[PDB]
């Protein structure tokens, strides 16, 4: 996260860290949506351009963390992956369309003050909250500058941008399965996700029932916090159908 601030303890109980076993390193951000399912970006697991194609055994899921590098004894819980599911129509060749994936943990994780699932939006919640100007929250242990490493989980609130503006800011083909967020150059304020935050959650707090909902997944961006550029996110609700099938199919 660029231009964010340290997260408060338990501020994001659903934040999940994708950790690479060998060598031990931060792989990506992700989210806890139930005691056995973790949501993240498809490219975090599969992305040929950068020679990336992880399998269950290469990954580890760390939940309930605050500190980035330290092993938080008696607080975080490390889970092993049982099966990874990547959207069948995930376009890693062109524009990362449908940049979403599910990971089934081998054993359910125990909820606590630092571990708690986030809600997946329904059509209505998405409809009324996913609007230009409405702010969302993005969190992660990713880089602080485009080019630097945080000690504590970072957080920043960012405004959703009008679709036209998003499209006019890049040469990449934008789809309805994507939305972009960030401050315009003249707005004064700034901030954005960055390398390492990818796969992480873009959440919003419903003013209707005071619950947190994950509307997006950190998908891609050109650089980090550049004037005129915006971070792009996977539109969770538009892909919820797939999420349902996976869970209501292989889901325990």
């Amino acid at each position: 996260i660029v231009e964010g601030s340290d997260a408060e303890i338990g501020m994001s109980p659903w934040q999940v860290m994708l950790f690479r076993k060998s060598p031990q390193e931060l792989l990506c951000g992700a989210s806890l949506i139930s005691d056995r399912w973790v949501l993240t970006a498809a490219h975090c697991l599969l992305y040929p351009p950068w020679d990336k194609n992880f399998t269950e055994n290469d990954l580890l899921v760390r939940i309930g963390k605050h500190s980035r590098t330290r092993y938080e004894r008696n607080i975080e819980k490390i889970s092993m992956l049982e099966k990874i599911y990547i959207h069948p129509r995930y376009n890693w060749r062109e524009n990362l369309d449908r940049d979403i994936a599910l990971m089934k943990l081998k054993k359910p994780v125990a909820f606590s003050d630092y571990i708690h699932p986030v809600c997946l939006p329904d059509r209505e919640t998405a409809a009324s909250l996913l609007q230009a100007g409405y702010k969302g929250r993005v969190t992660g242990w990713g880089n602080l500058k485009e080019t630097g490493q945080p000690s504590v989980l970072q957080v920043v609130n960012l405004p959703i941008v009008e679709r036209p503006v998003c499209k006019d800011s890049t040469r990449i083909r934008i789809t309805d399965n994507m939305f972009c967020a960030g401050y315009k150059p003249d707005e004064g304020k700034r901030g954005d996700a960055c390398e390492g935050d990818s796969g992480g959650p873009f959440v919003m707090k419903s003013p209707f029932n005071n619950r947190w909902y994950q509307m997006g997944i950190v998908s891609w961006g050109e650089g980090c916090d550049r004037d005129g550029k915006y971070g792009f996110y996977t539109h969770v609700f538009r892909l919820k159908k797939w999420i349902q099938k996976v869970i209501d199919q292989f889901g325990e």
Binding site: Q24, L60, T69, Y71, I78
Partner: peptide, 10 residues
């Protein structure tokens, strides 16, 4: 710079 994690998870 990631602190060692219990090898049990490995």
């Amino acid at each position: 710079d990631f602190e060692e994690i219990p090898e049990e998870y490995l």
